[PDB]
């Protein structure tokens, strides 16, 4: 039986974390739906998301929340990235001026055992594409190009995306600190 449970309602995040942390027999999976607080800071939202997901499932839980801070929007959306891609789908490439396309793709894991909340944060420098390209992946992957690379997260496979994305450095930090 598992001792840690990764809670997400997003079935595309589920197949990413099962691609690397899938063979760990100490990790289970839950699908409880939580409501995030209104703040652009990633550290504040992921810390209030774990206390709201432990209250739902009542087991040691691991939650995940991201950020897409943009220099042209002075850090917007930040942790408000979920309603931007709902509203501005590929017009988000158009509302940003050409010449200052730089942005940061941040991502955070927070595991709560019922007594303590520990936040792990990784981060990837990049720049917003001039137009959306690529088919693979999911939300905002056709618009983000990492630094040095020419391609998007959507144009790369799941092994190649996790060699650039924040989750590929968060697998090893979550495995080491939890013994998965």
């Amino acid at each position: 039986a598992p001792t840690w449970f990764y809670n997400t309602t997003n079935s595309e995040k589920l197949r990413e974390l099962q691609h690397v942390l899938g063979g760990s027999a100490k990790l289970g999976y839950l699908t409880a739906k939580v409501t995030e607080i209104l703040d652009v800071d990633l550290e504040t939202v992921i810390r209030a998301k774990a206390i709201a997901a432990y209250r739902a499932v009542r087991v040691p839980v691991i939650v995940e929340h991201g950020a897409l801070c943009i220099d042209a929007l002075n850090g917007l959306p930040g942790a408000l990235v979920k309603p931007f891609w709902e509203s501005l789908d590929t017009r988000l490439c158009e509302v940003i001026p050409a010449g200052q396309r730089t942005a940061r793709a941040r991502g955070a894991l927070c595991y709560c055992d019922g007594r303590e909340r520990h936040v792990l944060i990784e981060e990837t420098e990049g720049e917003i594409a001039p137009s959306a390209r690529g088919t693979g992946g999911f939300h905002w992957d056709p618009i983000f190009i990492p630094k040095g690379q020419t391609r998007t997260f959507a144009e790369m496979s799941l092994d190649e995306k996790l060699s650039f994305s924040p989750l590929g450095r968060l697998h090893t930090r979550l495995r080491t600190e939890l013994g998965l």
Partner: protein, 277 residues
Amino acid sequence: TTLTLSEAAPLLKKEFREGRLIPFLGAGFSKPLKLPDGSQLIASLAKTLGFEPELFDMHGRFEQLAEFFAISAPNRLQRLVYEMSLSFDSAEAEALREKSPMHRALAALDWRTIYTTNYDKHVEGALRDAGKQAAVLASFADFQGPRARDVCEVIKFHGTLDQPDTIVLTESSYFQRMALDAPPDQRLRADLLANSFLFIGYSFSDTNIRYIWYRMNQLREQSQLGVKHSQARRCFFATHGAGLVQPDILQQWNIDVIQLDPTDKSASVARLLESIA
């Protein structure tokens, strides 16, 4: 600090073959029958009173919101029992009960006493489905009534829907049971003197259940037994989602926690009841 399923299985076989294991079934045992738990009742009481269900929840505890419901109008509690009877003991809840793996695994064992705190005929009804016969005991007239010789006695600890005077739901009915003078209270305290219990689908939120296990330790500590002998007779608490505080409170009362797999709640309970056989 917590037993697993394979660790607790030889401990439950020993108490069962000696005839000293008694199941205690809660509201989570009728959850696969699509019945309300203690939270969906309050969502239904708030709709009748004109409350939003999230605003009604923050004015008091479960006992106190039902006390407020019962005194809102005359005959308001009688209507609730009628509505619960039509919803809890409906024919589609009967049909989900034969194909339920927990109720089949419960009735496959040859119990002698079963305690429940839920108002539905789905624990004795599970015994009728397996060809066995049961005897519901809820009031004083049931205990003095005629039974057969060797029949599993199902003790409806909080009452039955066909005897609406026995249902304890409001706060005043929980305070009336603090005297421990009701016939289900007197039968429970005498069975607790000699038997191990198995809590399935029940969470210790009732302050009269916790008060009975409190006062069994006042007999246990005053009898001045050793460290070895006062810890010999244990009770078992099967729960998917016990927190961090409640398992250590119950270690005082010789209650061990059996951690079940929370991914599938119904199959984890059914494998526990099949491991006793």
